[PDB]
């Protein structure tokens, strides 16, 4: 029983992006994102979710991509960050049948960059290479709730609480 979420962005530019990614609900597709920054579309393959409130979590996942773009343009703008790139984000819960098991993993380029260390809500470096990069990642990821206590809740909370619902 679990929900795994699967976001790739490919940057041309700082400015501009095209996304793909896709969520299973106890291993069975459920939900695709696809297309560019200006008109992604956000859509669940079951009506798992009544509309008002898909319409809530679609909102809600816009959002994120936009705060999302949004970081990778401060790190480009703060540190040296070449273009183009890819990032994936790999998140989700798992149910044993006790304590969840969640995650975020984020990579660039293809190699490990940083992960949310769940179990006081910090992130921390995937890479042995010391980097300005990773570090003011880390600095930002780290300062603020949105990505520390409230990412906990989404994963521990909403995420469980979704795959009770609908497994
Ligand atoms: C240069 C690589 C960037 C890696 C970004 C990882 C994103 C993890 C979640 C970010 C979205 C939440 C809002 C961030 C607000 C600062
Ligand atoms: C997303 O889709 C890709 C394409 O096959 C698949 O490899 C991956 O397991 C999927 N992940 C999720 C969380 O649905
Ligand atoms: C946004 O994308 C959808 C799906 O590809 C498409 O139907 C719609 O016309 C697009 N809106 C634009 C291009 O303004
Ligand atoms: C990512 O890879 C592309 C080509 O593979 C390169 O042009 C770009 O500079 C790389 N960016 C980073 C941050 O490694
Ligand atoms: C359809 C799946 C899109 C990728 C997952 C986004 C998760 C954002 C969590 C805040
Ligand atoms: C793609 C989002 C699925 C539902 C997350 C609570």
Redesign the pocket.
């Known amino acids: 029983q679990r929900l795994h979420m699967l976001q790739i962005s490919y940057f041309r530019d700082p400015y501009h992006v095209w996304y793909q990614g896709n969520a299973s609900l106890g291993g069975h597709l459920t939900h695709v994102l696809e297309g560019p920054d200006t008109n992604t579309t956000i859509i669940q393959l079951q009506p798992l979710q009544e509309p008002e409130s898909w319409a809530r979590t679609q909102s809600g996942l816009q959002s994120?991509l936009l705060?999302?773009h949004?970081?990778?343009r401060?790190?480009?703008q703060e540190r040296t960050?070449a273009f183009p790139?890819t990032?994936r984000?790999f998140l989700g819960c798992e149910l044993p049948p006790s304590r969840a098991h969640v995650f975020?993993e984020?990579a660039?380029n293809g190699s490990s960059?940083?992960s949310f260390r769940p179990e006081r809500a910090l992130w921390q470096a995937d890479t042995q290479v010391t980097s300005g990069?990773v570090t003011f990642?880390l600095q930002?990821?780290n300062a603020?709730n949105?990505?520390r206590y409230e990412?906990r809740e989404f994963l521990e909370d909403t995420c469980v609480q979704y795959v009770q619902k609908h497994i």
């Open positions: 994120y705060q999302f949004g970081l990778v401060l790190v480009h960050l790139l990032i984000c975020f984020v660039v960059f940083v990069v990642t930002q990821l603020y949105r990505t990412l």
